[PDB]
Amino acid sequence: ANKELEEKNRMLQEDPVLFQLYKDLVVSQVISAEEFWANRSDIIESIFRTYPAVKMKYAENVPHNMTEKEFWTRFFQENSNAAIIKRFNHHSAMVLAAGLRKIALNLKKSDRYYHGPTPITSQDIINSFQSIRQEMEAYTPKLTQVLSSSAASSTITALSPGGALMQGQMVPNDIQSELKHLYVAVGELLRHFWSCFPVNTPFLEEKVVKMKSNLERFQVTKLCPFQEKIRRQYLSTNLVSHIEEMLQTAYNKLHTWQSRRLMKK
Amino acid sequence: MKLNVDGLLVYFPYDYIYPEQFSYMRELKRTLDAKGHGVLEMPSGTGKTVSLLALIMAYQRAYPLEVTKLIYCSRTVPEIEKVIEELRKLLNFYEKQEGEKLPFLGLAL
Amino acid sequence: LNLLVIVVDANPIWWGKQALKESQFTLSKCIDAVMVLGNSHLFMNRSNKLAVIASHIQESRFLYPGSKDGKYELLTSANEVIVEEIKDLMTKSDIKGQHTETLLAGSLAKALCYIHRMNKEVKDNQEMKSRILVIKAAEDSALQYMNFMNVIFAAQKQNILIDACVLDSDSGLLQQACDITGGLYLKVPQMPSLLQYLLWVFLPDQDQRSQLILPPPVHVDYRAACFCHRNLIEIGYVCSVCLSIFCNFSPICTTCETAFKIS
Amino acid sequence: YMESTVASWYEQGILENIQRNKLLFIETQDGAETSVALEKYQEACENGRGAILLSVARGKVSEGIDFVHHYGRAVIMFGVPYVYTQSRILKARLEYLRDQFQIRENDFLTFDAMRHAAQCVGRAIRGKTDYGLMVFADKRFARGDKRGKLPRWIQEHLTDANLNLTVDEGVQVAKYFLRQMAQPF
Amino acid sequence: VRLGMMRHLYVVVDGSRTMEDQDLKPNRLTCTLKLLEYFVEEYFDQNPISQIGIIVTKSKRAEKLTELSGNPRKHITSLKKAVDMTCHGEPSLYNSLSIAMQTLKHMPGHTSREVLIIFSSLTTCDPSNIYDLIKTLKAAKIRVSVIGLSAEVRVCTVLARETGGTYHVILDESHYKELLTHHVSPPPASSSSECSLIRMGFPQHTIASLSDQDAKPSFSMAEPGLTLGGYFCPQCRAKYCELPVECKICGLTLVSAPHLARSYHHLFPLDAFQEIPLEEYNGERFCYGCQGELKDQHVYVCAVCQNVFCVDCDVFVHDSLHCCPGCIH
Numbered sequence A: 001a002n003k004e005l006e007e008k009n010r011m012l013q014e015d016p017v018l019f020q021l022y023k024d025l026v027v028s029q030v031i032s033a034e035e036f037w038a039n040r041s042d043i044i045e046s047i048f049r050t051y052p053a054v055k056m057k058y059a060e061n062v063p064h065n066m067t068e069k070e071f072w073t074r075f076f077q078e079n080s081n082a083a084i085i086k087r088f089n090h091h092s093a094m095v096l097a098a099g100l101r102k103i104a105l106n107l108k109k110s111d112r113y114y115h116g117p118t119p120i121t122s123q124d125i126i127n128s129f130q131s132i133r134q135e136m137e138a139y140t141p142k143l144t145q146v147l148s149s150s151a152a153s154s155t156i157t158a159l160s161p162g163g164a165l166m167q168g169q170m171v172p173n174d175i176q177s178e179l180k181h182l183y184v185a186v187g188e189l190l191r192h193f194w195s196c197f198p199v200n201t202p203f204l205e206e207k208v209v210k211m212k213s214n215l216e217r218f219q220v221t222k223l224c225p226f227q228e229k230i231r232r233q234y235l236s237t238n239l240v241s242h243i244e245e246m247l248q249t250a251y252n253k254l255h256t257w258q259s260r261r262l263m264k265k
Numbered sequence B: 001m002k003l004n005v006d007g008l009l010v011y012f013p014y015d016y017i018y019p020e021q022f023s024y025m026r027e028l029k030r031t032l033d034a035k036g037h038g039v040l041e042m043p044s045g046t047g048k049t050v051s052l053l054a055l056i057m058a059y060q061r062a063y064p065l066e067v068t069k070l071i072y073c074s075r076t077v078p079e080i081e082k083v084i085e086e087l088r089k090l091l092n093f094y095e096k097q098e099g100e101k102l103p104f105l106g107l108a109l
Numbered sequence C: 001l002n003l004l005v006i007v008v009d010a011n012p013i014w015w016g017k018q019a020l021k022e023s024q025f026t027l028s029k030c031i032d033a034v035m036v037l038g039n040s041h042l043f044m045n046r047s048n049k050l051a052v053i054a055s056h057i058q059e060s061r062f063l064y065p066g067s068k069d070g071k072y073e074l075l076t077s078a079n080e081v082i083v084e085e086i087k088d089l090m091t092k093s094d095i096k097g098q099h100t101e102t103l104l105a106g107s108l109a110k111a112l113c114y115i116h117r118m119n120k121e122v123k124d125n126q127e128m129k130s131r132i133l134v135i136k137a138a139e140d141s142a143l144q145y146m147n148f149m150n151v152i153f154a155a156q157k158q159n160i161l162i163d164a165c166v167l168d169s170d171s172g173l174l175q176q177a178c179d180i181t182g183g184l185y186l187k188v189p190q191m192p193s194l195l196q197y198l199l200w201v202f203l204p205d206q207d208q209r210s211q212l213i214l215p216p217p218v219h220v221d222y223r224a225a226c227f228c229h230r231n232l233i234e235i236g237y238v239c240s241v242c243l244s245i246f247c248n249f250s251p252i253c254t255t256c257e258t259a260f261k262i263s
Numbered sequence D: 001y002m003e004s005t006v007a008s009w010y011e012q013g014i015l016e017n018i019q020r021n022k023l024l025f026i027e028t029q030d031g032a033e034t035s036v037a038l039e040k041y042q043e044a045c046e047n048g049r050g051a052i053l054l055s056v057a058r059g060k061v062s063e064g065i066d067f068v069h070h071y072g073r074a075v076i077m078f079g080v081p082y083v084y085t086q087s088r089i090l091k092a093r094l095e096y097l098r099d100q101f102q103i104r105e106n107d108f109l110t111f112d113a114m115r116h117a118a119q120c121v122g123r124a125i126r127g128k129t130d131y132g133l134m135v136f137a138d139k140r141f142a143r144g145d146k147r148g149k150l151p152r153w154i155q156e157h158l159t160d161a162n163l164n165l166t167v168d169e170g171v172q173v174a175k176y177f178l179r180q181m182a183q184p185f
Numbered sequence E: 001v002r003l004g005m006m007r008h009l010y011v012v013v014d015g016s017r018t019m020e021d022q023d024l025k026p027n028r029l030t031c032t033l034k035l036l037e038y039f040v041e042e043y044f045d046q047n048p049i050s051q052i053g054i055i056v057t058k059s060k061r062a063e064k065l066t067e068l069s070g071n072p073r074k075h076i077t078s079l080k081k082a083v084d085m086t087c088h089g090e091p092s093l094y095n096s097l098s099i100a101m102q103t104l105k106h107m108p109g110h111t112s113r114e115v116l117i118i119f120s121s122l123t124t125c126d127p128s129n130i131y132d133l134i135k136t137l138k139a140a141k142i143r144v145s146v147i148g149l150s151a152e153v154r155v156c157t158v159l160a161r162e163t164g165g166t167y168h169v170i171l172d173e174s175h176y177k178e179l180l181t182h183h184v185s186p187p188p189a190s191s192s193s194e195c196s197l198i199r200m201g202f203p204q205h206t207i208a209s210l211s212d213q214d215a216k217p218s219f220s221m222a223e224p225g226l227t228l229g230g231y232f233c234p235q236c237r238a239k240y241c242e243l244p245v246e247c248k249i250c251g252l253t254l255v256s257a258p259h260l261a262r263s264y265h266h267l268f269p270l271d272a273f274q275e276i277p278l279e280e281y282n283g284e285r286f287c288y289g290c291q292g293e294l295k296d297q298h299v300y301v302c303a304v305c306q307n308v309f310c311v312d313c314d315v316f317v318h319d320s321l322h323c324c325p326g327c328i329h
């Protein structure tokens, strides 16, 4: 069965981003599209599930030279007294049947938390203690001692934008959408490329797919710089270099892990 | 759980008894001591069986000649099964307390 | 209204080192500047209230729960009480060589529970916007990181702003602390002119802080390190019990003793 | 009487609402149907559906069955249980008791009703201290004679404040009592 | 007692008709959502590494209102949107638990998978028997702790006790607050629970190097404008607006040191302070914690520092600060 074709038809226009990126991977003819998907009323329904007799009657009386309004009409249509009680008992039983369809912790080193990841003679204490004890025999010098006009102005000037302690562009708009779309494409493909990269996966069938994905990295990064070139030759302003870091770091991881694999071999 | 009933000391398997159980046991012991037929009512569906059985067993031990045996009747067999379960639990508790088997027989027809 | 709390780090070791150095700045002038700041804070409005805490290596003590010189009786009482209590605390103090680092965080906890008590007692009609103007004066202790982080998170939940005013040293822990709760961080390099910094950067309350130009926040280095040799690490291997940042993959982390199963 | 009430509720919209609110099961004279209905009722009490079991006080099911925790939580009594006043067997049984042992006919009739009601309403307190409420939807029970003949344990709990609650007031107090019963000792 | 610091929790809300009944002072559904907003925010504030997910079940169908995420604001917005939900239909425990199981099956073993079903309508119409699903839940070690409303449901009682969770029924709104606040805290790890090391990454906030030289412009990663500076990743190298967040590429959790430090108080619970009403030779009128006179005949003391704390001081210390001020010294 063409289940893949049916799914592609379903998602062809319902979701714009998914199909946009999947098509983009083919617009420049990067790779085959197989890997793309390889890696990744109420009343009548209630009656249908309630009355098996109604189900059989519907199957035998499927609309044939009749009308659904007439079928609806057929629904509602001491001997009668006991029939009502029996009907409730049977109906509740049918509803119920339809619903019943088949370590104490111990530690040896706690001061490590007291000094967590945050990083980092005797007569001196005596001298400082006595000196500070004798320091404050006089108090309330606020009248002049606390502040002076010259020092006050210098702080003002420092607080000024050009002073110390106080250091002090949305021109492009349409380029924003293009950058977002490119970032989404990079994320989409990096997801599969990094899906099993961190795990060692020392198996033949597991490593085959990482090798294929690593080649796909070359093949996609082949086309990325061409769009980069198109965008660059406009104004030579507002450089977009963050995208380069992702590609270069992915390449560095690829090559370093290749060298590590060769060393392990 | 050994209860120092006014008449005698009576064993009891569960940990605690409500005051209504004390009243039930004392009234029942009064009736047995009088050796006269009587009637009494207790609310709980369960618990009355264990209290009654324990008191009857203790009275039998104290005055075996006074009472030859107990004939405990229930409405239905499914119900009397629960009674025999209660009696089995009580006998196991008493046997553990005594440390050995005693000449006591209990059965349902 | 606003409830201000000044947590002064009056470390005798460091301030007496300054006294021995005979530098221009002194603990007396620092206390006077803090006093002036509190007086101005209450001067702002009647409903506003303040409190003061002093830190020492041993413990931390509150410095605050006519018009001889023609002065607001209330501010006169504040001056007298703070002066007397600070002199008493500095004059009387035991000596313990083993413990010399200043216990700044322990006071913070006292400040937080004091603010909670005041918030409970105050009438529900008026809303109180409390603040803690921490004034550090000495290097922090490594062993206090955990408790200080606890109190910082409690302050974040309770909506109190920790405005740090470190001087003579940049405490990474304290800057991290104020960054979490959004309090301002000012490092005054001119100690003699410290009070001008208070009457501008710190004195304005959270109500007007947004609608005012103040020095930009300093970048915070949220570093992580393994528990072995104490060094920056970008990737940490924590477990589900210790929640400890470690060096490298190990059969079992020492602080856990758990029976980790390989895979 | 049960059939007549059920038929009236069916003609009105109350019954459809009752079925939507909680599954409904009814008792019949035939023992096989009674057993099947009760078997499904137990599962309903266990499963999320819940259940409203309509039965007759004289029905063998009422005497045989025992209701425990999460079974028959709220026992509803619709009308004082009285036997039909035409069955001639009871006429001999009753007039003979009047002639000998000197029991009034009304006295014995009310005794036969109260004993039966206590039998059919006393199940919810089976054991293990399992909460539950017994609601009697009849002003006759409010009469002093019925209360006096009621068993002591139920009557002493019963109070004048809740003796003759309106339907809505009874519902509210039942909700509050269930709240209090909910939560641990 | 071993505790699972990292837990993926699903708060299953039922959009049943019974939620329409206004048993509580406001509408039942509105009250539950309003309080569940607070529950979500507090849960994130008390377990940053953990993440939450909401499944709304109505009309016999369960829909994922919000997938697993580390951002409380997104879930809060989802709650506010759901406040206006129609609230018509019948819930399906099988459907809701199956959706939760499908999402949680691929979750890492080390993390604790948990479900909190806020059950309102006692009925449970499901396509398949739930007793069978109970076996799969036990096999998958997914803790399920139901909170019933106005009903002691038997199937949910057996669900909770068999799967290891706890069952409760709302006595009132105040007790509902207490129940959810209790469920906020991490549950103790049982014998079935297992612990394993989890890879973690610690990013550093970065800005323009020097006067916007060799800048690193970028918009966001899950209408984001250009950002001069922000957080980054050791491996993704993709700008992240806020932390903590799971990597969109690596699959590794990015989280800073304070977020981890926020959970140490769970490992270090504070021992309850004995309450002595009498003064007991406590001549200090001022409470040490708050330096205020003790206006009530109550005092609290530790077993180490032996300090004095009033009612408010002790309550606050054991509730929020989670550490004794004086006893820190």
Ligand SMILES: [Zn+2]
Pocket (backbone or CB within 6 Å): C226, C227, C228, C229, C246, C247, C248
């Ligand atoms: Zn290391």
Ligand SMILES: [Zn+2]
Pocket (backbone or CB within 6 Å): C239, C240, C241, C242, C243, C253, C255, C256, C257, C258
């Ligand atoms: Zn560990």
Ligand SMILES: [Zn+2]
Pocket (backbone or CB within 6 Å): E233, E234, E235, E236, E237, E247, E248, E249, E250, E251, E252
């Ligand atoms: Zn990453």
Ligand SMILES: [Zn+2]
Pocket (backbone or CB within 6 Å): E287, E288, E289, E290, E291, E292, E309, E310, E311, E312, E313, E314
């Ligand atoms: Zn206090």
Ligand SMILES: [Zn+2]
Pocket (backbone or CB within 6 Å): E302, E303, E304, E305, E306, E307, E324, E325, E326, E327, E328
């Ligand atoms: Zn203490």
